[PDB]
């Protein structure tokens with residue numbers, strides 16, 4: 313079954329989740345009970361969409377035929393630092409429960425700042441793991457740049473939260489765990505100067521906290 | 530109450546944890562049951578060691594006094610990519626359960642990709658790591674991070690520790706698990722990035738270390 317987290321308020325009037333007060337929160341999008349089931353349900357959504365596929369063999373590269381998605385040629389996951397590292401670590405653990413083998417590497421953007429260590433993505437099935445898509449501009453360009461220089465057999469994006477109301481361009485992620493309002497959310501990887509990243513639930517931040525920590529780290 | 534994972538064997542004779550098979554594995558160092566409570570026992574061990582402390586005030590830096598570790602002057606976590614991103618993802622969520630304010634940045638070494646945190650001088654900083662075996666890697670980093678930033682404290686928390694493979698003198702102040710002197714896999718440990726997303730720490734079968742040689 314599902315043991316969901318209760319959302320209420322304290323005597324001070326702060327948003328609480330199972331007793332712990334959250335003065336930063338204005339609303340609660342999804343709690344860890346709701347967030348986590350969006351993943352084991354999508355881990356199978358990803359498992360159903362990648363397990364029959366066949367891409368370029370690299371175990372025995374002296375092979376002109378496409379090998380399936382095995383441990384010898386696993387699906388390539390590119391996680392977008394710094395926000396999706398919690399979302400990814402929970403995700404790839406779920407993909408193992410569903411039996412889809414994968415290998416993960418990271419990318420830091422603001423347009424590459426820190427770069428992949430993977431080299432053979434040509435003719436492969438690749439999967440970007442991002443925390444959220446708001447305007448769409450960050451992931452619209454990132455898949456252009458990956459698809460351009462690497463030319464994979466497939467490059468689709470999987471994000472946890474998706475607010476389709478803030479889109480300046482056309483970016484529609486192929487796999488979405490949660491759809492949130494057009495608001496700035498904090499928690500489960502979402503930050504305000506790296507604060508509130510380690511909160512287990514995704515809350516809508518009180519606008520009064522917008523620039524609460526202006527000092528550079 | 531702790532619900533431990535049962536560890537049996539296959540019909541083929543491979544390591545089985547919760548009915549799932551692991552032919553990669555020779556034994557089980559610790560399963561998710563024991564690994565996870567180990568971190569909730571360190572998240573408070575880390576909490577008690579950092580909550581009533583102070584360091585440089587970069588929030589109200591127009592003043593001179595020392596400030597306690599709050600959401601405005603938090604603990605600086607240095608997470609060493611790549612095989613460490615899961616241990617530091619599960620722990621900082623336990624740190625918040627113990628009310629310890631934190632901020633995390635990622636370093637990648639052999640340094641390859643650098644930090645982006647800059648004001649670490651006079652701060653309380655925390656390294657979270659894969660594992661300590663020889664000690665060369667985590668002693669060089671302490672000799673590095675100390676020299677570059679000169680923090681008020683630089684302490685290393687590691688999930689697993691093998692004191693038998695030590696080549697130099699490294700002693701991590703915070704350890705979750707002590708393992709034998711051999712190669713581990715599962716939960717962030719790898720052979721060429723495989724088995725990294727498994728939720729249990731196994732000791733690798735030596736016949737599997739060269740199983741997948743091709744570069745990614």
Ligand SMILES: O=c1[nH]cnc2c1ncn2[C@@H]1O[C@H](COP(=O)(O)O)[C@@H](O)[C@H]1O
Pocket residue numbers: 395444445446447448449450451495496497498502503
């Ligand atoms: O609602 C959110 N909460 C916290 N950060 C966000 C949110 N939406 C977008 N971001 C951040 O802003 C960046 C810009 O993404 P974009 O708006 O899709 O171009 C993202 O990569 C996130 O780092």
Ligand SMILES: O=c1[nH]cnc2c1ncn2[C@@H]1O[C@H](COP(=O)(O)O)[C@@H](O)[C@H]1O
Pocket residue numbers: 612659660661662663664665666667711712713714718719
């Ligand atoms: O047994 C292991 N399994 C997987 N990776 C390991 C193991 N032992 C060491 N490593 C990696 O190799 C590095 C060497 O560090 P050192 O042995 O402490 O000097 C570690 O920081 C890990 O990234």
Ligand SMILES: [Mg+2]
Pocket residue numbers: 393394395
């Ligand atoms: Mg970010």
Ligand SMILES: [Mg+2]
Pocket residue numbers: 610611612
């Ligand atoms: Mg590594």
